[PDB]
């Protein structure tokens, strides 16, 4: 709504469904993995007020991409697969205009990718149980 | 503008239908791979048609009905006896899922769309339909 643009929600049905909604500007993602990705920490601007969203499960390692001064999220791939009897992201990284990360996770399944020829990453929605089952974006220019 | 993808590979040449007002009907010919697409859309008052791709294949149409946008795009991108192409193409309206098209699998690739639409598309082409992106809008 507001005109804004959602793409995917790459992962499975499990889980429930969590929205961050888009951010004025992104300043940190932090994902959290193991044999898959169990978590997404979102640190944002949003009505000039600083936010921090925990997505996903608990578990995993921190994997840490800091925007600095003009860097933008200009891409995100990654693979969905069964853990468990449960469909969730097993992999999962993110390209800047500047460098490219991941992708972290160790679980293979099957792949996605979201290459943005112009535009960039706003925020991010899915769905999250004890792993992070479903990942999607906004997008802006 | 928010232009995301463009799936395959680098050979062919570069084609870019830029936005549509409305797109009306979408035509995958493919046979093997994904020879090519045909675009038929409204644009500042006309209305045009636009075909990227080789000239092989059958045709398989989608016509959009009142109120009927594009809500995501799925295929294959693969090595077809030497050039890196898409394989298989479909497409998905906010009432049913078409194709895919084409019966040469590869690297998957996937675009659902929860909120938007695909306005238009570009990328690159020759023979066949090397690869494919879209113009995403509200
Ligand atoms: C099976 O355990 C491995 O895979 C899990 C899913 O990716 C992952 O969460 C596990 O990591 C641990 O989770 C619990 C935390 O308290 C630990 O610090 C963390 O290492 C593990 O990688
Ligand atoms: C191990 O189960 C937990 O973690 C899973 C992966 O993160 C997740 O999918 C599970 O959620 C359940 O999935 C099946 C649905 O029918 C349930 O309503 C849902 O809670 C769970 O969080
Ligand atoms: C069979 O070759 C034609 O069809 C191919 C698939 O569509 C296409 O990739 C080919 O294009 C050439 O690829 C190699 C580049 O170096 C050339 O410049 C390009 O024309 C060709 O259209
Ligand atoms: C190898 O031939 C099959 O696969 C090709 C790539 O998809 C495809 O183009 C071929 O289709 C034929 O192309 C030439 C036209 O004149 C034919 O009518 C058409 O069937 C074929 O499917």
Same mark, same amino acid.
């Given at each position: 709504?507001?005109?804004?643009?959602?793409?995917?929600?790459?992962?499975?049905?499990?889980?429930?469904?969590?929205?961050?909604?888009?951010?004025?500007?992104?300043?940190?993602?932090?994902?959290?993995?193991?044999?898959?990705?169990?978590?997404?920490?979102?640190?944002?601007?949003?009505?000039? $007020?600083?936010?921090?969203?925990?997505? @996903?499960?608990? &578990? *995993? =390692? +921190?994997?840490?991409?800091?925007?600095?001064? #003009?860097?933008?999220?200009?891409?995100?791939?990654?693979?969905?697969?069964?853990?468990?009897?449960?469909?969730?992201?097993?992999?999962?990284?993110?390209?800047?205009? $500047?460098?490219?990360?991941?992708?972290? @996770?160790?679980? &293979? *399944? =099957? +792949?996605?990718?979201?290459?943005?020829?112009? #535009?960039?990453?706003?925020?991010?929605?899915?769905?999250?149980?004890?792993?992070?089952?479903?990942?999607?974006?906004?997008?802006?220019?």
């Amino acid at each position: 709504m507001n005109g804004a643009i959602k793409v995917g929600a790459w992962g499975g049905n499990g889980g429930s469904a969590f929205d961050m909604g888009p951010a004025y500007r992104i300043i940190s993602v932090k994902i959290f993995s193991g044999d898959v990705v169990d978590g997404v920490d979102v640190t944002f601007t949003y009505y000039g $007020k600083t936010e921090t969203r925990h997505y @996903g499960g608990s &578990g *995993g =390692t +921190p994997h840490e991409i800091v925007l600095q001064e #003009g860097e933008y999220l200009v891409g995100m791939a990654g693979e969905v697969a069964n853990y468990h009897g449960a469909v969730v992201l097993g992999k999962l990284g993110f390209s800047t205009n $500047k460098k490219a990360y991941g992708p972290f @996770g160790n679980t &293979g *399944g =099957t +792949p996605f990718s979201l290459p943005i020829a112009a #535009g960039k990453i706003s925020g991010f929605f899915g769905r999250g149980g004890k792993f992070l089952d479903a990942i999607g974006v906004y997008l802006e220019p």
